[PDB]
């Protein structure tokens, strides 16, 4: 009985840990995805500036 | 055994919901920087037009 | 003699069950690292796309 219980508990812990591990790093994934556009505009700043430095 | 059944049934959904809330919060945090850069574009466009 | 008969009958099954529980626990421990690496793949894929 102890073996059956431990096997089932470890099996459940497998996917619960998988889902958690996705959960923490979804934040970083979306943060980088947004930083793409953030830096795009932060660098378009001086593009616009140098356009009229002409 | 059913204890772990319920533990899975709760934890998996909690993590799945946390994924969505974290993604939306990450977008919301950097929306401010995105807009401030987009308007700093015009700020600089005129701050150089004075030159 | 029958004492040792019963001792074998108990110990062998206990060890056989321990083999399975240890294998499953070993898989469960490293599932976390496997998934965190699999998602760090995309983390880095975008952290370099910003460049």
From Swiss-Prot, chain A:
- Naturally occurring in which organism (per UniProt): Homo sapiens
Which part of the entire sequence is included in the shown chain?
215 to 268 of 428
Give the protein's function. May act as a scaffolding protein within caveolar membranes, functionally participating in formation of caveolae or caveolae-like vesicles. May be involved in epidermal cell adhesion and epidermal structure and function.
| Post-translational modification as stated in the protein's UniProt record | ZDHHC5-catalyzed palmitoylation may be required for the formation of higher-order complexes and for neurite outgrowth in cultured neural stem cells.
What does the subunit comment say? Heterooligomeric complex of flotillin-1 and flotillin-2 and caveolin-1 and caveolin-2. Interacts with ECPAS.
Identify the tissues in which this protein is expressed: In skin, expressed in epidermis and epidermal appendages but not in dermis. Expressed in all layers of the epidermis except the basal layer. In hair follicles, expressed in the suprabasal layer but not the basal layer. Also expressed in melanoma and carcinoma cell lines, fibroblasts and foreskin melanocytes.
Q: Which family does it belong to?
A: Belongs to the band 7/mec-2 family. Flotillin subfamily.
Q: Where in the cell is it found?
A: Cell membrane; Membrane, Caveola; Endosome; Membrane
Under what name is this protein listed? Flotillin-2
From Swiss-Prot, chains B, C:
Q: What subcellular locations does the record give? A: Cell membrane; Endosome; Membrane, Caveola; Melanosome
Q: What family classification does the UniProt entry report for this protein?
A: Belongs to the band 7/mec-2 family. Flotillin subfamily.
Q: What does this protein do?
A: May act as a scaffolding protein within caveolar membranes, functionally participating in formation of caveolae or caveolae-like vesicles.
Subunit and partners = Heterooligomeric complex of flotillin-1 and flotillin-2 and caveolin-1 and caveolin-2. Interacts with ECPAS.
Record protein name field: Flotillin-1
